[PDB]
Design a protein around this ligand. Structure first.
Ligand SMILES: N[C@@H](CC(=O)O)C(=O)O
Length: 270
């Protein structure tokens, strides 16, 4: 009846802010979240946090929410998982929720809920920049061009895993252009230091919709990469999967998720 929940900041799905200075509490639509390093203070809000609030209410559990510091979403290195996936896999958390992408590798070792956000991989470029998309040889045969195209991703997640598995030559080229967070990637794109940023589609599309001046645009990967979704990670064989799935499927049909997309993921640019 009390669940430990791991999450990770990735705006606008999970947004972290200090407690209200005046009250010392998390006000508005925010909820208390602590750091993995530790153990109000910090407070979390956003699309995934609203999902979590509704699940807790509908299913009837209480929870302790914490932010992962041991890596990010989840990466397996030399036999060991880090990030949100590792927290669930090693049973430090009963579930993990955030912008967490379902893939085959992860699905082998944790159970996921049904997907509640559609995503995949997209490419973001400055509106001026002329490429056709991820099929462009500027991407696919990157060192065939005299001044080479500069393109990168934020490493360690499902995006990099997909590129390394399916397009190993392109992946090897991208390594020098790894970015530490989406915020720095966007900054490099705008400074011309990158020509393109390849990343999670749900996040990139949102960033395009919110770009001041609407100067950043995304191209869908088309057939280059498959579509997938965000899912809540749970212990393999978790008793929580079924009630969570039922709730999520209910939210979908009630237009509750659609409402939350409007609330959190809308922007001015189109
Ligand atoms: N949401 C993705 C982030 C990425 O593509 O790097 C993940 O769970 O790994």
């Amino acid at each position: 009846q009390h669940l430990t929940v791991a999450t990770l900041e990735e705006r606008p799905f999970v947004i972290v802010e200090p407690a209200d200075p005046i009250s010392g509490t998390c006000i508005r639509d925010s909820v208390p979240c602590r750091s993995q390093l530790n153990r109000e203070k910090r407070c979390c809000k956003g699309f995934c946090i609203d999902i979590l609030k509704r699940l807790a209410h509908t299913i009837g559990f209480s929870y302790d929410l914490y932010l992962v510091t041991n890596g990010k979403h989840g990466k397996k290195i030399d036999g060991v998982w880090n990030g949100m996936i590792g927290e669930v896999f090693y049973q430090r958390a009963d579930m993990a929720i955030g912008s967490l992408t379902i893939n085959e590798e992860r699905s082998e070792i944790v159970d996921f809920s049904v997907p509640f956000v559609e995503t995949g991989i997209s490419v973001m470029v400055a509106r001026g920049t002329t490429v056709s998309g991820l099929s462009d040889r500027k991407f696919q045969r990157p060192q065939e061009q005299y001044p080479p195209l500069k393109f990168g991703t934020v490493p360690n997640g499902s995006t990099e895993k997909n590129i390394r598995s399916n397009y190993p030559d392109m992946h090897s080229y991208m390594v020098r252009y790894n970015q530490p967070r989406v915020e720095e990637a966007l900054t490099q794109l705008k400074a011309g230091k990158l020509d393109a940023f390849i990343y999670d589609a749900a996040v990139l599309n949102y960033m395009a919709r919110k770009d001041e001046g609407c100067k950043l645009v995304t191209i869908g990967s088309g057939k280059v990469f498959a579509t997938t979704g965000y899912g809540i990670a749970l212990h393999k064989g978790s008793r929580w999967k079924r009630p969570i799935d039922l709730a999520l499927l209910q939210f979908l049909g009630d237009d509750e998720i659609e409402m939350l997309e409007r609330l959190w993921l809308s922007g001015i640019c189109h």
